[PDB]
Amino acid sequence: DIELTKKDGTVIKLSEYGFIVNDIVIDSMQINTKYQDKENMNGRILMGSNYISRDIVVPCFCKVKNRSDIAYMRDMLYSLTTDIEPMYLREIRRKEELNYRFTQPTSDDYVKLDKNNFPDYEYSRHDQQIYVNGKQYKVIFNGVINPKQKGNKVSFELKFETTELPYGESIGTSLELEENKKVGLWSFDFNIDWHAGGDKRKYTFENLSKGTVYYHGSAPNDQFNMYKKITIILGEDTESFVWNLTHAEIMKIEGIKLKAGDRIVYDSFRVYKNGVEISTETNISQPKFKYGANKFEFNQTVQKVQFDLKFYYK
Amino acid sequence: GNYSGEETFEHAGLVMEARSALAEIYGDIHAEPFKDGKVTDQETMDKELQSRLKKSLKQSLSLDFLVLRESYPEADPQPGDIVQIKSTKLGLNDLVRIVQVKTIRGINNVIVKQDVTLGEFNREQRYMKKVNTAANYVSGLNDVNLSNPSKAAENLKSKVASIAKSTLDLMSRTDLI
């Protein structure tokens, strides 16, 4: 219940700004269907079906000490939130409906009050809220009205909306999973084994014709807009270079001659032959990680493969 | 229609004018006369002429047809057949012929609807065929130059009159000898 927003150049959270929130409700993704009805047949063909948009709603109110200040506070809200600038929203929850604790009415152990006139139930460090999950959402704002209930309390009804892709982009790459350097950004929503360096954590293999990958993301990383990015030290010289993959298509690189120690950066629908001067004419096919086991099969025992990606959720 | 190929108006060759029965109440009008013709007899010159007449008071009935399957199934429309239509409150009981038909068939070759046109196929389609004939006859040619056309035709015509002048000179010079 804070509605964190990471904008291009800053980080903001509402309750820091005197802005309590009632709740956050996140719709699912609007499935746009594409059916076609045959003329006299009791059944209609599915041309397609496709996720579109994940409309968020967040009603937030605010109290202040005096009626004038309402105006300022409201303006702050707009200047703080209503941003066409695609932002990264992060949801927050509490772990408990906190109450005031027992005290002693002996002219001592009195109660605290926040900067806003409320009772601080958060006595200890471990009371305040948490990033409930290690993911974000690429988000933009839609119109709000501000009904002023009595006093200094005024409500607002934010209506956020997904920007590019209706998915729960996981923050942090898969290499931070590999190297346990960055802390946070890994919630139990992702069923992740502790065996760092073990299987289903590793995306850095060496000297293999074929290997195994566990894509922890329920949603499939077929869309190029996702940050799926591979880089391979090819290991062995060749004239052509095929690699296959399951839950995806076959990939070739024919017609250009390579060398062993040369490396390929295989970005989404894009191929850096040696990091620059992209040679992407050969078999334009992009790979697709669906969920769980995504087994790959090279053909000449690359001396290194490693690939970072982002986990996406539905 | 019997004057020779080289005359073009000294109107030998079965000069005549005909008319239909309805003329006498409508009166004096006339279409483009049957100028082009190398036909000898007069039996032709009345048939073709009355055909030029009666083809022109045009009637296109672009009605719509709706198929009844459970009842009246024996009406699969086929072009070039006789049919007896009759619309009350229209002044119509005569019989006509189909000239266009338009079937659709979803699955199991069951019909959904029909469209038809009677007599002449349409006013519409006549216009459209006229347009497409213009647009395809043009662009099949090569003499066309949109910037000042008629150079290709006027060059030709002036060449023709010039050779005719030279031929006149030759005629005089030969009749001399």
Automatic annotation (TrEMBL), chain A:
The record's InterPro entries line, in alphabetical order, gives: Siphovirus-type_tail_N
What are the residue boundaries of the Siphovirus-type tail component RIFT-related domain, all occurrences included?
A: 7-161
Protein name as it appears in the record: Siphovirus-type tail component RIFT-related domain-containing protein
Q: From which source organism is this entry?
A: Staphylococcus phage 80alpha
TrEMBL record, chain B:
Question: Which Gene Ontology MF annotations are present?
Answer: phosphatidylcholine lysophospholipase activity
Coiled-coil positions are none
Mind telling me what this protein is named? Peptidase
The scientific name of the source species is: Staphylococcus phage 80alpha
Q: Which residues of the full protein are shown?
A: 212 to 388 of 633
